[PDB]
Amino acid sequence: PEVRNIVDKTASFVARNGPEFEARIRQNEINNPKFNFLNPNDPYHAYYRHKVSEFKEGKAQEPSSAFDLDVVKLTAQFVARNGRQFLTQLMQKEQRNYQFDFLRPQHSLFNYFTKLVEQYTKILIPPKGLFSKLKKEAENPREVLDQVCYRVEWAKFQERERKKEEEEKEKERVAYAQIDWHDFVVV
Amino acid sequence: KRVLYVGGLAEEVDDKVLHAAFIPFGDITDIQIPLDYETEKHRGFAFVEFELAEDAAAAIDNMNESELFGRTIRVNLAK
Amino acid sequence: KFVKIGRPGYKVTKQLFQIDYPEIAEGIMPRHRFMSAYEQRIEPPDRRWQYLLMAAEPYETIAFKVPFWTHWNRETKQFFLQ
């Protein structure tokens, strides 16, 4: 395909360097119809100038209470010592002839029980008061400054997160408020 | 809050339809789909009030934006 | 005013609505809504059936009769609503 390869070649040279090189090369070889595809003179005018666009844009191919709080404290004392997922000191307390009103997960007090369990765990980690105690807190204002700055850096990242989330949600809400409202149709 | 409020009842949708479509979660004690009495056609607003909160709730959360008679029903929070 | 209507399609299955779509390379995720069938340039009678449409930028939106709870996997280019 001679004319096809010519249109595709001028298409690659015009996808790289363009109609300015078209004017140049046509003024340089406008004596012969080898550039008549890059000039008005051949049938490859349209196919050529369009294939340049195609191979440039990416369409063409390379040419080829105290009580309740205490009960919650006892719940935390039982959740600190419950050593198996199905065995503990509270499985008995549930159905063992007494009331068990913090044993619900669908109760909202389950959340305060989970917080009290997190506190009992913060006391049950060996670095939390079992048999080792570090004094970088009891005599450490420098590690305390490091920790203040660490909280502040987490806060800065979090402020950035909140701002980006607010912006993203606002843009998405505007996009839904400008989404296609006329051409409703099914396939 | 022991019900599914299902907007989008299809043409062939009856109280039996809503009760059976929500009963596999829980026993529908009341049900009805509000039709403009000028049509005898379900209009897309129904109530299936069962006995079990867990039932009605897991059904409202599961069957959200489904398809029945080719038409989309939406079982959500009854208020 | 810059809304190019390219006319690609909606290639989705209902039955839980799923679509395949090309990647527009934008932070906009698809926005969906179900509404009444009263707005159009014709409005043929018998307008009580409604358009549930999830539209986005690079694809023709998945709309249909319909007389978050979803997402779009972007590195895989697949939209799911449940």
Do C9 and C58 contact (CB within 8 A), yes or no?
no
Note whether C63 contacts A185, CB cutoff 8 Å: yes
Crossing angle, helix A66-81 and helix A109-124, to 10 degrees?
A: 50
Nearest CA in chain B to C49: B71
Convert chain B into a string of H (helix), E (strand) and C (coil). Answer: CCEEEEECCCCCCCHHHHHHHHCCCCCEEEEECCCCCCCCCCCCCEEEEECCHHHHHHHHHHCCCEEECCEEEEEECCC
Q: What is the dihedral of CA C64, C65, C71, C72, to 10 degrees?
A: -10
For residue A50, give Cα distances in angstroms to A62, A64, B36. 14, 18, 60
**CATH number of the domain bearing residue B28:** 3.30.70.330
Do C37 and A182 contact (CB within 8 A), yes or no?
no
**Chain A interface, Cβ < 8 Å to C:** 168, 171-172, 175-176, 178-182, 184-187
Taking the C-alpha atoms of residue A4 and residue A10, their distance in angstroms, rounded to an integer, is 10
For B72, the domain range is: 1-79
Q: C64 and chain A: CB distance < 8 Å anywhere? A: yes
Give the number of other Cβ atoms within 10 Å of residue A159's Cβ. 10
3-state secondary structure of A43: coil
Note whether A180 contacts C53, CB cutoff 8 Å: yes
3-state secondary structure of C77: coil
Chain breaks in chain B (C to N over 2.5 A) after: none
Contacts of B9 (CB under 8 A, 6+ apart): B17, B18, B33, B42, B43, B44, B45, B46, B73, C67
Q: Tokens 């008005």 map to which residue?
A: A40
Contacts of C1 (CB under 8 A, 6+ apart): none
CB nearest C27 (choices: A168, A180, A181): A168
Taking the C-alpha atoms of residue A163 and residue B1, their distance in angstroms, rounded to an integer, is 36
Taking the C-alpha atoms of residue A7 and residue A5, their distance in angstroms, rounded to an integer, is 6
Tokens of A89: 């000191």
Q: C61 and chain A: CB distance < 8 Å anywhere? A: yes
CB neighbour class for C32 (10 Å; exposed up to 12, middle 13-18, buried from 19) = buried
Q: According to the entry, how was the structure determined? A: cryo-EM
Note whether C67 contacts B9, CB cutoff 8 Å: yes
3-state secondary structure of C17: strand
Give the number of other Cβ atoms within 10 Å of residue A127's Cβ. 10
Crossing angle, helix A2-16 and helix A19-29, to 10 degrees?
A: 130
Nearest CA in chain C to B63: C82
Structural domain count of chain B:
1
Note whether A187 contacts C10, CB cutoff 8 Å: yes
Do A28 and A34 contact (CB within 8 A), yes or no?
no
